[PDB]
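Recap quiz, item 2
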Amino acid sequence: SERRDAILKASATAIAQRGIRGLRVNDVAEVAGVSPGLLYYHFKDRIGLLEAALNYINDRARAYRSEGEGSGDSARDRLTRSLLGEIQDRPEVVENSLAWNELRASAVYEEALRDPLARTTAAWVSEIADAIVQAQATGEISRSLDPQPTAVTMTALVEGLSGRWLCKEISTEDARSHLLGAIDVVMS
Amino acid sequence: MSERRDAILKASATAIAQRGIRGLRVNDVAEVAGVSPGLLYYHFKDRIGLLEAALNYINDRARAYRSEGEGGDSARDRLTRSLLGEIQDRPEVVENSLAWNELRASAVYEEALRDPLARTTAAWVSEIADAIVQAQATGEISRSLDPQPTAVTMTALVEGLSGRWLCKEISTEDARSHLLGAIDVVMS
């Protein structure tokens, strides 16, 4: 239902602005424009809600990273879309990445969020790792790179730079240029 | 008073690591530290002064682990020790990492935290940049690397890996190995 989506979008804004710690269902209910009873009806409990919101935000992120996909795109093209996709000045990209940044931070103490975060992050890593393996078969990328470690490292860098970006500690342009520099290093 | 400033900051680091910025209370910190709230305000003025000083305390503590064993002569030796020293199964390193993780996440939505965090992060970045510049003069590193962006990138990589490490999403030994491979790629 479009109400579920609307609830989830509002929850991601509550998450983004207030942070997860001490966020309660009634707070979320207030921003979502529904009662806590309806909210529990859709999501069962607070963790069910956070996990639904994490899945919603992951889906939008996946879209941002796949914008402009094309048949038989180069390794460079694949790495670039997936690494840069979530750091853009477009307002709904920023809102989405703010909420993901907080969910990543919260999972240190919200242990029930660790599994969905690990699995969705595994799927991002896997995109990069696959791009590398395909290129290594052709020679287009150094064969001495270990694909999975390289992909885990490149995406963790995105998370680190994105945390600074969201602090306004580094510009959008600089964060993207650093990532491009990393990609250049891997192709060279 | 300098023994007492240190007790205050040590207790502040623990409060931040365990309870986050919202769970940090002057009265509790001061009680932990065996001092009065008024002494804390005398040295640090206010809650933002406290947090600024705690950011620097944590960075000073991390710096000790970054240089442990130092001078371990090569640029490679110094860079490796610095980057790997951030991620270790030692109680102080874990705590520093948790507290930094909290501060980095909170500064997104608490704007007052941004300037101190930027200044402390800039100091960490500078140790790494200086290492790279020194090594380009000796020729231990490609003169191709721009020191500042590289140092920004490497330290950002430590923060991204640490965020996953603290969620138990990546093991300590995996995170260390990936930092080593990153340094290798940069040292090539």
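Chain A touches chain B through 44 residues (CB under 8 Å).
The domain at 1-188 of chain A is CATH 1.10.357.10 (Tetracycline Repressor; domain 2).
End of item.
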